[PDB]
Design a protein around this ligand. Structure first.
Ligand SMILES: Cc1ncc(COP(=O)(O)O)c(CN)c1O
Ligand SMILES: Cc1ncc(COP(=O)(O)O)c(CN)c1O
Lengths: 430, 430
């Protein structure tokens, strides 16, 4: 058996301090048939809750911990930095070191600007795209998440190609009016969107691999088609690689799929688990950012030495072979979980995009948000509870992939599969 | 003499990696008659550049380092956390601990939500204000900075009370249309703004002590008047205490001035030098934030254990007497610098607001942005160079105060004064 008492107690406290008892909605566990699991430590692929329970971590702080928890190098260098200073509010050399590493590893990024989050990265990218092009409209994709920036908190309007609507209360009046939302992997609706608004489309923002509606790889020609249509109409291509960056492949999703955006939003891995983000791309576009250009973007704690260091030390330990091992781990994971699902009549479909993996509780292929929404969400809710009990910490959402680390072992994968077999059998006997 | 060669070399590198060679405009030093000083370490009130030069730090990472650099407790606890984990993407206990401390110390904050920056804090607060009230318009003050959030990148329109204009390229079309900008300390223009748009004014955002146009204390009745007018029209009062928070006074500027806002945006100190931010306030308002309410705001790395810990350990070491010492340090600083200025015919005016201090190179009282803009900016540019050479690291902007720490000694203040005497004499001989 497994006790979650301290997490129960901690969450009770949390609920009287924060909205939903959390600093981010997903952490409320509202869709997984158990209450939030409070974590206190981790080591490699293992995460430990405040109840001392061990889990094989497939959340990995939602992407940053690509080397697992508390990587020795990363941690010792972090302690070293802490000794010298957390922050200086002045330029540092580590900012240069990560900047150039990011520039050397991310194809489209020639000039980068560090920020405090993916939300800031994308928000700044959208503003950059609009300021650089002198255009108002942004095209995004249904199911893609870019952060809680107002300019991005938008939905599809009434119609096939559509100037959007606000996707939340509090969003500035008519902020969504200059934003188009078409289905992911729907290149034809993109073509239609440009036919109507193309000459005012500042940019197209896309997750080159959707990871916030589950892992949803791009369809053949989808990203290239976005690259072509943006060029044709003079629009910018913004790759939201906050999650895909340094995770899908060594050279990111843009390197993996050989499609080079004008702008790239990064985060997670580049902070090694600390608050971070960045937007970069072509120099002449990035030059428009303050203080060198008119487009204003500041951050007093941006390029934080601790985050720059952790991200630097994380990335240094990643090689092409890391991703080879991810894929091999993903293969066994997919195979083992899929066979388990078959054996117990569990509807399932896996999506693979480079080293990114995730499955849906549906037999129908997930190629967009609509087909992701076809997943058995209640089954996932139940399944999740069973997996946590078997020592597997999954993202408390069906609309998330399985985050792999370099620290995940074959034994971890086997135990994860065995955990799924057990959980699927139980569900099937019901 | 003093060499800045490594910083010269580092900045040359920086310029080919980031816009303006920086992750934030002010760090480019464009207004101070010397190029950016690269920092590598600090200890208490001392900051050290990459050239090994020692400075008495009056920037303190722009506010977070209220205990100075590398505070022993803060650093050791940071190392302890690094051992356990940088981030978990799941709820933690330290999030609770800082949350309640913030709730126990900031008067208006009953429920808080941690974010990655002050920009996110204010942006989320504006969205909250607009979502909670179902209203579109936000009133801000000329000279006040709340972050690079689009909803806030706005300026005053043509007219006395005015629906605003975009204050940067790239800002979404007509996002500023629902934002009013009136001069700081100009309560009459606030009254006029409400007469015209009051029933659609979602909230009034203000720095209870302006610190981004220099230190500009509120005038008698200004904050109370804002509190009254917002209540009268059902608008929210948002205190941007990202800088003032835990710096102006123990109970923040809202406690210091005895004016309680509906919402409070926090940052800096609460991260102890790590990327951080938070917005909080009345529970029923904060409850509207996701997942407990409809107003969407997420952050995957929000409530970062390292930032929560550093901020917690920073705040724990602050007492009422810390601020007593700030004021006493500020008195000698003001007196010594003012006498030096008098002696050398240097135009000067000091502004004090609690433990916040700053001076302007003008003899005319600075009560708003317009009068702050009356300062001899070229004199400041020159003066700054002289001060850095004398071992005093000031904010590379006239529109900034002097950040004090608990680590600043009487000797530091004396040397800072002596540095100002020397610099003023040199300038006066010209
Ligand atoms: C009062 C105030 N509010 C908002 C912000 C936004 O801060 P950040 O650059 O971290 O987004 C700042 C900057 N520290 C600030 O001083
Ligand atoms: C692809 C993508 N883009 C943008 C964001 C925004 O991230 P954050 O919550 O840190 O602002 C996320 C969240 N990690 C993301 O996964």
């Amino acid at each position: 058996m497994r006790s979650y008492e301290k997490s129960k107690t901690a969450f009770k406290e949390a609920q009287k301090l924060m909205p939903g008892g959390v600093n981010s909605p997903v952490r409320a566990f509202k869709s997984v048939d158990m209450d939030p699991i409070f974590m206190e430590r981790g080591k490699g692929s293992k995460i430990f809750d405040i109840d001392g329970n061990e889990y094989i971590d497939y959340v990995l702080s939602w992407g940053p911990l690509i080397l697992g928890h508390t990587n020795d190098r990363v941690v010792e260098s972090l302690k070293k930095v802490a000794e010298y200073g957390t922050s200086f509010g002045a330029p540092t050399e580590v900012e240069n070191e990560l900047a150039k590493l990011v520039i050397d590893r991310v194809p489209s990024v020639e000039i980068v600007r560090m920020v405090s989050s993916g939300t800031e990265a994308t928000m700044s990218a959208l503003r950059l795209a609009r300021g650089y092009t002198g255009r108002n409209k942004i095209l995004k994709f249904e199911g893609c998440y870019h952060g809680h920036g107002d300019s991005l908190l938008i939905k599809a309007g009434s119609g096939v190609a559509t100037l959007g609507l606000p996707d939340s209360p509090g969003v500035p009046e008519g902020i969504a009016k200059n934003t188009i939302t078409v289905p992911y992997n729907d290149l034809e609706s993109v073509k239609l969107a440009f036919q109507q608004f193309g000459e005012d489309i500042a940019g197209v923002i896309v997750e080159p691999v959707a990871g916030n509606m589950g892992v949803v790889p791009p369809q053949e020609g989808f990203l290239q088609g976005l690259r072509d249509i943006t060029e044709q109409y003079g629009s910018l291509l913004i790759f939201d690689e906050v999650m895909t960056g340094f995770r899908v492949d060594y050279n990111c999703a843009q390197g993996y799929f050989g499609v080079t955006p004008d702008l790239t939003c990064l985060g997670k891995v580049i902070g090694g688990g600390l608050p971070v983000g960045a937007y970069g791309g072509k120099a002449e576009i990035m030059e428009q950012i303050a203080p060198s250009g008119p487009i204003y973007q500041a951050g007093t704690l941006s390029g934080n030495p601790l985050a720059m260091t952790a991200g630097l030390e994380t990335l240094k330990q990643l090689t092409p072979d890391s991703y080879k091992n991810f894929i091999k781990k993903g293969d066994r994971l997919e195979e083992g979980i899929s066979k388990a699902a078959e054996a117990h009549g569990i509807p399932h479909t896996f999506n693979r995009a480079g080293s990114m993996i995730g499955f849906f509780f549906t037999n129908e292929p997930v190629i967009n948000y609509e087909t992701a929404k076809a997943s058995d969400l209640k089954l996932f809710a139940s399944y999740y509870k069973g997996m946590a009990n078997e020592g597997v910490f999954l993202p408390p959402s069906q609309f998330e992939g399985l985050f792999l680390s370099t620290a995940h072992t074959d034994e971890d994968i086997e135990n994860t599969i065995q955990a799924a077999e057990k959980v699927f059998a139980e569900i099937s006997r019901r």
